[PDB]
Structure formats: structure tokens, C-alpha cells
């Protein structure tokens, strides 16, 4: 049966095509893990209590997607401001008494400006990010920022310590741009919304194509994504079946793996009976863990030396 299954699954691999990786290299990567993905896409369904609430969907995407300073940084300039408590720049003067209503610092001003649109698209106000950059050090950085409602959002920061300024301040600038997370979970990228539908049992006892809203992405994680509120933890799903194995369990892993391989080979040239595919999936999972059929993978087992 396994031999017949192997020949059956082998036949339509010769009729393949070559966005999202498909075709022969995708099949090879799936069958021959390769702790590497090339497509970290993971699917997320909302809470069913939020059916078609677009503001809810974008609130969720703002909650889930990681950003940096560089996501919102445009204007990053440096200045020499001699008076510590009076600005040479004539625009920033009211903010002095805004924050002024702790002296032994360099008279060197670093100054950052962001986008209003790229600020509140992700639904964060500038007060808490000024708070965030304040609290991440609190010891070395005297940090001043404006109101939200100003025409140009500004950050004023200085190094405080009771010659040798430029390169230190440049490196600290580079560090705060490259490292400081804002919200979300890192290794997750841009996220978009499709208007999918789903066959759903009717209250009168029939079926109906009903719309709903979904989340897709370009990054992979599992240990954090069910934690955030407003999310179905159950029906989450990812192509990257190794992570499903590791987080959930090997039975869920083989189910997900069979689902993925069925999708790939049913993209075209479908179909085959389920039993062959299931036999293959379960025999390559039946060792308590994933096992690619390599020179090293299944062969390094308690198995006959001649095979």
C-alpha cells in the first residue's frame, strides 16, 4: 500500500508550474524541512463577537504588528543648544514651560520629528512614546516632548552627567533608532485584511455564505499571538507547521502538515485519495517528532542496514 501510495503521490509532481511560494520548491521545502520557511505567513481569525468592525480590525492590527522608531522617524536632526533652559530654536519655546512648571547636562540637543499620519495610523499618541523613551533610561536622558496637537511633533533629549559629544551622541541616536520596540511582537511585519466568507450553519437550519474579517501577515510567531485580546485562540493557523508542532502537539502537527500538503498538491492537478497522503504524513511523523526523508533524517534510525 505504501509503495502504491508513493507512486500515486509521485505521478503529478511532473505537472507543476514554476507572491507566495508554490510549486516544486515549495513542495520540496515542505517535504524536506529545513528549519527555514521563506513564507512566514500565519492566518488569524478575530473574535466572533466582532463580525465586520473595521475599526476593531485595525485596532487589532495596531496591537499585533511590531514597529520601531524608524517606522515613524522622518526628521532626525542634531543641534548645539547652549542654554539648557532656553531654546535657540524659536519654534520650541512654549514647550520649555510646558515641561517646566537636573542641570548638569551637555548643551547638545538631539531632536526628532515624526509623522502625524504614521503616528496615529497605529493609534499611539506621542505622550506615551515620550514616556517610553523616558523610562527606558531615566538616568542618562533628560527627555522633553511637545503636545500631540502641535503642527510638528518634536522630541527634545539631552545627555545628563555631573569635548567628546558628537560621536557618543551619534551612536546613542543610532541605538535608539535601531533597538527600541514600540508595541506589537517583533518578527511580525505588515498586516492586511481580506474580506473572506465562510460557510456557516443558518439559524433556520441551512447553510449560508457569510462574510467575516481576517488577518494575514509576513512574519511568524506563536507563543505571543494568542495572548493578545479580542482574538480567537482556537482557530488560529499557520503554514509553518514546525511551529504548530512545537506549540500545540504532534497530532495537531500532523493534521496541519496534511492540510498544507493537500493545499499545495490540490492547487493544480488534483486529486488523489486521502489514504495515500495520510499514510505518508503519518509515517513521516510517527517517531514522536518531525522527520524529513533525507540521507540523514529517517535513515539515522533503528532500521535495517540494507535499506
Partner 1 sequence: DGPTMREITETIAEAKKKVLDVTKEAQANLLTAKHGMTLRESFEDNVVRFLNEARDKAGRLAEVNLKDLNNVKQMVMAGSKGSFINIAQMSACVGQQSVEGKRIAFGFVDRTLPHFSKDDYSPESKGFVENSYLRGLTPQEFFFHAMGGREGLIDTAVKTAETGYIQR
Partner 2 sequence: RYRVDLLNTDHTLDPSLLESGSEILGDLKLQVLLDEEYKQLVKDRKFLREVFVDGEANWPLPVNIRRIIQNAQQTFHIDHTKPSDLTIKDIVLGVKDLQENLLVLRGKNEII
Partner 3 sequence: DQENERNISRLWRAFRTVKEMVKDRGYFITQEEVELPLEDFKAKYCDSMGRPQRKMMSFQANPTEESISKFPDMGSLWVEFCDEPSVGVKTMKTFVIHIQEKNFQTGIFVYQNNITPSAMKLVPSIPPATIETFNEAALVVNITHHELVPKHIRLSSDEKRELLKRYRLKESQLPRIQRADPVALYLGLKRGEVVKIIRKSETSGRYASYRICM
Q: Which does 140 bind (CB under 5 to 8 A by kind): partner 2, Mg ion, partner 3, none?
A: none
| Cα distance between residue 152 and residue 107, in whole Å | 23
User: Considering the complex, what minimum distance in angstroms separates the CB of residue 11 from partner 1?
Assistant: 9
Asked if 162 is part of the footprint of partner 1 (rule: CB under 8 A), the reply reads no
By a kind-dependent CB cut-off of 5 to 8 A, residue 199 interacts, out of partner 3, partner 2, partner 1, none, with: partner 2
- Left if phi > 0, otherwise alpha if psi is -120 to 50, otherwise beta: which for 164? left
Q: What angle do CA 178, 179, 184 make, to 5 degrees?
A: 115
> Strand runs (DSSP E) across 83-151, as ranges?
108-114, 141-145
Q: In the complex, which residues of this chain contact partner 2 (CB under 8 A)?
A: 199, 201, 207, 273-274
Alpha-carbon gap, residue 107 to 81, rounded angstroms: 5
CB of 184 to partner 1, least distance (A): 20
Q: Which is nearer to partner 1, 168 or 293 (CB)?
A: 293
Nearer to partner 2, 273 or 302 (CB): 273
The answer to whether residue 252 forms part of the interface with partner 3 (CB under 8 A) is yes
197 binds, among partner 1, Mg ion, partner 3, none (CB under 5 to 8 A by kind): none
Exposed, middle or buried by CB within 10 Å (0-12, 13-18, 19+), for 212? middle
Q: Please, which residue, 31 or 180, has the CB nearer to partner 1?
A: 31
Of the candidates 199, 223, 221, the one whose C-alpha atom is nearest the C-alpha of residue 210 is 199
Spatial CA neighbour of 168 closest among 244, 110, 85, 252: 110
Under rule CB under 8 A, residue 226 binds partner 3: yes
In the numeric block, the cell 535601531 is attached to 178
* Site residues (vs partner 3, CB under 8 A): 223-224, 226-227, 229, 233-237, 244, 247-252, 255-256, 274-275, 286-289
* Site residues (vs partner 1, CB under 8 A): 10, 13-14, 16, 18, 24, 27-28, 31, 192
Amino acid at each position: 500500500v505504501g509503495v502504491l501510495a508513493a507512486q500515486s503521490i509521485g505521478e503529478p509532481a511532473t505537472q507543476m508550474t514554476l507572491k507566495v511560494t508554490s510549486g516544486v520548491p515549495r513542495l520540496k521545502e515542505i517535504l524536506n524541512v529545513a528549519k527555514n520557511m521563506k513564507t512566514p505567513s500565519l492566518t488569524v481569525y478575530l473574535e466572533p463577537g466582532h463580525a465586520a468592525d473595521q475599526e476593531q480590525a485595525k485596532l487589532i492590527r495596531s496591537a499585533i504588528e511590531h514597529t520601531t522608531l524608524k517606522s515613524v522617524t522622518i526628521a532626525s536632526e542634531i543641534y548645539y543648544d547652549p542654554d539648557p533652559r532656553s531654546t535657540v530654536i524659536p519654534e520650541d519655546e512654549e514647550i520649555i514651560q510646558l515641561h517646566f512648571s537636573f542641570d548638569q547636562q551637555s548643551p547638545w540637543l538631539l531632536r526628532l520629528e515624526l509623522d502625524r499620519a504614521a503616528m496615529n495610523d497605529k493609534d499611539l499618541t506621542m505622550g506615551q512614546v515620550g514616556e517610553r523613551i523616558k523610562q527606558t533610561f531615566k538616568n542618562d536622558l533628560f527627555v522633553i516632548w511637545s503636545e500631540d496637537n502641535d503642527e510638528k511633533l518634536i522630541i527634545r533629549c539631552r545627555v545628563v552627567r555631573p569635548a567628546e559629544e558628537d560621536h557618543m551622541l551619534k551612536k546613542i541616536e543610532n541605538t535608539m533608532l535601531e533597538n527600541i520596540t514600540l508595541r506589537g511582537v517583533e518578527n511580525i511585519e505588515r498586516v492586511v485584511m481580506m474580506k473572506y466568507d465562510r460557510k456557516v450553519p443558518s439559524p433556520t437550519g441551512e447553510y449560508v455564505k457569510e462574510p467575516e474579517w481576517v488577518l494575514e501577515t509576513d512574519g511568524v510567531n506563536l507563543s505571543e499571538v494568542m495572548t493578545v485580546p479580542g482574538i480567537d485562540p482556537t482557530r488560529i493557523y499557520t503554514n509553518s507547521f514546525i511551529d504548530i508542532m512545537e506549540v500545540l502537539g504532534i497530532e495537531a502537527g500532523r493534521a496541519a502538515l496534511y492540510k498544507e500538503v493537500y493545499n499545495v498538491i490540490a492547487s493544480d492537478g488534483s486529486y488523489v485519495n486521502y489514504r495515500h497522503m495520510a499514510l505518508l504524513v503519518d509515517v513521516m511523523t510517527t517517531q514522536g517528532g518531525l522527520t524529513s526523508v533525507t540521507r540523514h533524517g529517517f535513515n539515522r534510525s533503528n532500521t535495517g542496514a540494507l535499506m
